[PDB]
Design a protein around this nucleic acid. Structure first.
Length: 47
DNA sequence: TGTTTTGATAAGA
DNA sequence: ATCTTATCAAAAAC
């Protein structure tokens, strides 16, 4: 199958970043991934 | 040419 | 304008 966009290390990082209030929009641009991908890994209801 | 995850996208009592 | 969610066509890898 297709590889994941973010490995576990990046996941754990990105998690904290969002809990610190970083907009998914920016995070997506920086990590080179879709914005909707971010909502799937970390739902708004999960922060 | 054949069988997992990405990312646009539409809809949101 | 904005923000969120689940969907579904197809990229990505072998």
């Amino acid at each position: 199958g297709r590889p994941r966009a973010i490995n576990k290390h990046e996941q754990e990082q990105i998690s904290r970043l969002l809990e610190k209030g970083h907009p998914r929009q920016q995070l997506a641009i920086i990590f080179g991934i879709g914005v909707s991908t971010l909502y799937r890994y970390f739902p708004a209801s999960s922060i």
